[PDB]
Design a protein around this ligand. Sequence first.
Ligand SMILES: OC[C@H]1O[C@@H](c2nnc(-c3ccccc3)[nH]2)[C@H](O)[C@@H](O)[C@@H]1O
Ligand SMILES: OC[C@H]1O[C@@H](c2nnc(-c3ccccc3)[nH]2)[C@H](O)[C@@H](O)[C@@H]1O
Ligand SMILES: *Cc1c(COP(=O)(O)O)cnc(C)c1O
Ligand SMILES: *Cc1c(COP(=O)(O)O)cnc(C)c1O
Lengths: 810, 810
Amino acid sequence: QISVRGLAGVENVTELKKNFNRHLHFTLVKDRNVATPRDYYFALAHTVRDHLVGRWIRTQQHYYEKDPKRIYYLSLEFYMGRTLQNTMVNLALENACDEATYQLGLDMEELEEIEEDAGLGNGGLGRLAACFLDSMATLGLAAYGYGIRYEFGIFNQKICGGWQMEEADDWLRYGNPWEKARPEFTLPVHFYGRVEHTSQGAKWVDTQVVLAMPYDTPVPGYRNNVVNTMRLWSAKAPNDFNLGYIQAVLDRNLAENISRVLYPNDNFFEGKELRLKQEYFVVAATLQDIIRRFKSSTNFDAFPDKVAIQLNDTHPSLAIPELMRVLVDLERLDWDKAWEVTVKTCAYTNHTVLPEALERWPVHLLETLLPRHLQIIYEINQRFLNRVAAAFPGDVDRLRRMSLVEEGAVKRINMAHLCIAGSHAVNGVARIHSEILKKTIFKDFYELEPHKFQNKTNGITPRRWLVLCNPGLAEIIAERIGEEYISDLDQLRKLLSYVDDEAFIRDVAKVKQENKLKFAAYLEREYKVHINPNSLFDVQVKRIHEYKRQLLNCLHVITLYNRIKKEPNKFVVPRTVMIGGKAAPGYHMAKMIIKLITAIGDVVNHDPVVGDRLRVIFLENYRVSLAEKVIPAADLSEQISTAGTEASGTGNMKFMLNGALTIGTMDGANVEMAEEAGEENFFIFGMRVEDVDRLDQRGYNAQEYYDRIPELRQIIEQLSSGFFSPKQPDLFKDIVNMLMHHDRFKVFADYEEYVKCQERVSALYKNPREWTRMVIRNIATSGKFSSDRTIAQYAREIWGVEPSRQRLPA
Amino acid sequence: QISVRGLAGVENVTELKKNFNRHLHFTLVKDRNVATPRDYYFALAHTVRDHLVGRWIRTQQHYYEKDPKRIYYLSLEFYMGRTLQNTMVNLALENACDEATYQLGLDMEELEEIEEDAGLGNGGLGRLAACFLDSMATLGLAAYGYGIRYEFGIFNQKICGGWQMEEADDWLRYGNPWEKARPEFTLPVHFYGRVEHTSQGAKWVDTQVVLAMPYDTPVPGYRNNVVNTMRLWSAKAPNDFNLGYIQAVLDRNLAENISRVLYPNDNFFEGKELRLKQEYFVVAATLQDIIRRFKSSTNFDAFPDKVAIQLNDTHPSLAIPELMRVLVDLERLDWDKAWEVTVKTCAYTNHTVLPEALERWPVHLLETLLPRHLQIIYEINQRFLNRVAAAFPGDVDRLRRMSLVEEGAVKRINMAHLCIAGSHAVNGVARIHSEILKKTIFKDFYELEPHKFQNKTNGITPRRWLVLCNPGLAEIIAERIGEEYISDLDQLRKLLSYVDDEAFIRDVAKVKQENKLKFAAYLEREYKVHINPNSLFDVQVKRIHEYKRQLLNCLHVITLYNRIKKEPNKFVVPRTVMIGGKAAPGYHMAKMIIKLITAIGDVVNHDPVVGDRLRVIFLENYRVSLAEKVIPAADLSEQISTAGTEASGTGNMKFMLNGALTIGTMDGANVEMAEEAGEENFFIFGMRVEDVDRLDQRGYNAQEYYDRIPELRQIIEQLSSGFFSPKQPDLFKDIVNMLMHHDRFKVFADYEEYVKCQERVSALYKNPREWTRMVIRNIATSGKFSSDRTIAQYAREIWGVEPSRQRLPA
Ligand SMILES: OC[C@H]1O[C@@H](c2nnc(-c3ccccc3)[nH]2)[C@H](O)[C@@H](O)[C@@H]1O
Ligand SMILES: OC[C@H]1O[C@@H](c2nnc(-c3ccccc3)[nH]2)[C@H](O)[C@@H](O)[C@@H]1O
Ligand SMILES: *Cc1c(COP(=O)(O)O)cnc(C)c1O
Ligand SMILES: *Cc1c(COP(=O)(O)O)cnc(C)c1O
């Protein structure tokens, strides 16, 4: 059908059809008369997977032969989503498979909808890791993603009576055709025990052993025949574990619980023992695998020339003391040499400045679980603080501020400080965030070692986030500038010369309109909900958090509602306001916010005076596969965190690539997006970081806004009085109390400007041609936000390797 | 190479080779330069499995079309062993695969040794189920085996310092290529809850739900293209189970523990809740599947014409009240009609008369776990006892003896009584056992319903237990009488006309000698143990139990040792005495017996005066794959249980088929074996059942034997004094005390006759030609003990279906 989707040659189509029937028969053990759509999905998945394995084997053979520097990306989260369509896109097989399945009497889109998301992440950090893997393969890097194979990923969200309920995400129930178990490369990981000092160094003994079994998933580059590996570890008990007899076998679950479930917190630290075990488990198994591969080429001098380890936040920070442990205790390098190697190997990426998100582990935990690592951390701290004291003599407060050990009620280890000390590079994830790190929380470290600190602005992969989810848009773009932009996103600037082209203006707008129709039909089909497809689709999809300010959006929605009720017969630009995202199960305020959103919907959506001029929909179970549907359908992207809180954001970039305009604060990557497109082509409002700091110095008093803004006071009175909860008038008292007395994110302070800016949005939407022209200017300048750009910078500035766009042979 | 192993045609060999390379590449994702022998094993297994699926699909299609009566064999145990060689044998692929692998540079035997046993059974009962499945497929019956897919089967036995240690049998670690998960046919099973009575009958409510997920394994018939199904259930938690959040996910293990581990008791009842859950789980999932299949053809009148359910002992006895539950509560049949259907559908097989093995469940357990089933059982009991009272008026003691409810300290349900009441046929497993049932423990039931009681003497499959494990013997036999005997074992009688044939005598003896050499080499290779291959191989392999009297064997071994030490320069027929088998982990006396065996070995094997005239070897980790090695190598089969205790035995039959002579008591199937071969061709000794009864009436006094038999007294003094445990002189005090004061199995009473009979064995072994002639007479009359004969009798006399030897089309 469409050009970007590749060739459908007779030979290939014939071959695909026979391999599909072969898998249906021999692999699935079904005949056509009993096969369900799920059986068909699996036959297709195995058929496409067969095309990966050849290139996978020869890629890994190639790295063995040529022995390039290897990049190891260590993350506790990989939010992969679905694999089938991505694999087809990257192998140029989509049209052929479409043809082959069509000829067998099947709709491929329908089969694609059967695949479960691999939901092994919470949101942006996990999804960034997934985008990065795709870019690293596309750029020809010898890269491996290492993580944990959770049996249960991020929970499935149901809404019952307006409240979030959580269900286990049993994503492996029907099997995962993409992975390959590798039980032959199982590795032991140690816990507990004690340290023994001998004539010849320390020994960690009397440990409990848990086995780490790997599962490998292929990661195909874009049409270059590179297939890299994501290796995920699964916990297994040894066979003599606890070895009355029956109970000892049942107690194997204790050991195997390490890989059972993903902690469902986004931007929050929960200091539980099981989480610490997960962090050490991934680190200890991964480092043995790295060292094995390195030896299979005594001289650890060359280790940093052949290995880079990238720490995705502090979650795998134990890599630093584990590497020292291995080098000093097992390989018997002297301390100084070991530390040099470690520092040159490791680099650390920070993704947040929120204090409740920073990992600070109680010493008593590490002492019990990882007694040798604690000794090593203490030794690192002592030597690091000696360097500080020599650079800043007599500055005793600096010593206590920079220490890896925090004193207080309970002593804790600051994992961010450990990561800075033991890494040759530290980066933030957008220019403003990186500056904030140097100015505030890591200021002392920056003064000591300015050369360590860098920026690497985040990006998203244009394979998944344009070609795959928005083929219509990719096509009309390819018609004008060709296909090269898919792996060189800066070529989208060529689109600026079509900004006055009436044909292009029309096609851009038609593609959006079709995306909106298809999403509106999705809603009815799957959720019995009826929306006006001519309305402005105003969307805020991201995890539920106070700092992301879903509440500020809610205040606007109610304002629109009240203005309609005040002047019902006055014209307003119709909107469909969509908000979605998951709340962490223990985050009470987030759960209340969800309930508020549905409650506003209950009132607004059933008010005859409103009509279809305003609809408020809570999008259930937001996840990668839903993002690929709603993002191409959006007109307005809500990126409204308090300035200084959203380290980067990545949803923002997805919307910009897909033809939505952005309303947002000058926060995270929003600043660079506005800079790339021009501020005139962005709806910017609110306090800058400097204004927030000024307000904090003065003292934020919310009462003042309530007193001076009647529209705001009215909303608060509606909330308190039970207008949105008739049967339980005090239901939202916690929300009102927070907004009025302890709002850390200053919702009221940005209200007036937000509402005004939203009026300017409605004004522009009334003039379709000018809206579309501004859209074209956004799409055209979105190139900087390709993760290919991001990974090229990591590669050159941190890892010391050159990317390559050269194909390997097929 | 050999004829019985099938054709190695150029086309087939070429095809096998390409499919092997295809699986190595696409299935295993390996290249030849990294592949290990395990990868090669898996490539072969997938290649052979491909040849099954076609016939599997068309067999099951065929049963759908023709709708024959279906046979459901319900067992908690299926002791399958290895699958690869069996599958090749049954498909006529062995020589082709041998050729194909040879041409790829691989030894197929070596690859066969990599496969794990499926050890989902304890011993004879589980292995009988496996033999039965093979025969039912070979005889063309529409049969399904239903059980539990245990994650851990029977434990791996290690011997440390002469003591048994248990290790978990993680048999699924590397994957199981033979099974196919069928998550689409997952079924709910209910536990706990309470019963509600309405206007319209009882309702079982507030239950906890556990899901039953099936896994299907193919069961190929012998060269008839029939492939039947063994469906094994795995426990899964529902996704809203327990649904703070993390703990709720981790607590899914509670539900999933049901299918975690096989209870490792042979002939012993352990009344634990988890075991009861396993029993109900298999029954409840299986019966829904049966009823689904029956409806997919309102009229339950025809249910017994289309369904037979065979209960493998009482372990699945809850099928009876579950069937009533479904018919009465869900389908709303009246009680009397439901009971008629149930009785005509169910048949019960008893496998033991040992009182400690009989299942008697505490009412309080059933009351909590299965409250509706308890109500149904009470109702069955009341109506059954009304029939008893009407047939035997005023016989109040009969009423209490026959009740399903046992009164006492705790009230219990007698599951054997439930099974007799609710089955149209009840059988024992050898003629003497079946008579014992009618005379003793089920006498009252036999008087009430004599027509129910039958015999079905056990058998073993001659595919696994001759062709597969002893190809050399199968060949020399096929040279004379052709190949038809493999599926018509009675044809072995034709061998009686070769009893005076000097060529045949020589070939039989050479085959044995080669089996012995190959087993002696196995021992060195794998266990650094050096044995004389010219010695008589005297073997006792079976589970360790007091009733099997491994101790009587030990007493003989020590007698031989003492006689040598008394007259060292006198000639004796050299023996290698081999004893193997597992002890249940909680069975203290069994564990002591193992230690005694190794301790005797420690003394005997290192005594220079003995030389290589006597060796005592404990065979570690006895299991199906070890049985296939040691049984073809044996000269003497020890079948020495106390008369009346071994219901049948099946090991006995395996040895007879493979050219060993038997020393044994008149117990179980030994009686029929002696009858078939002629008593002159059997080494029978000891009390008959009648003599045991006489001794029990008088009172067994062990002291009397000790007083009158000096050789016995000497052994007991050696045991007590620490001769076999120098460092711990009192180590075997428990054993001595049991033998002297509370030996339920009368070891001393058979000692004199056992020793005398063993002298007659040694005398015959000194004359090779006459030994071999007696062997030929055993092999030639072993035909009755084919499980094909057994299953034909079940089919005609219990299930009401005719077997067929007709092939389906390939
Ligand atoms: O750089 C990728 C994205 O990381 C997110 C993030 N920052 N910290 C976490 C986090 C912290 C603890 C647990 C799980 C996730 N997630 C940030 O909040 C986003 O601004 C950013 O785009
Ligand atoms: O008929 C097959 C074989 O069943 C065995 C047997 N009888 N009861 C059990 C049993 C009882 C409880 C748990 C596990 C197995 N096993 C008998 O002891 C054997 O004589 C018999 O050959
Ligand atoms: C991109 C993405 C996110 C991150 O969105 P932000 O708006 O940057 O928080 C979270 N969840 C999913 C499923 C995504 O695809
Ligand atoms: C046949 C067999 C048994 C049963 O042997 P008996 O001597 O009848 O108890 C037990 N275990 C295994 C592994 C077998 O093959």
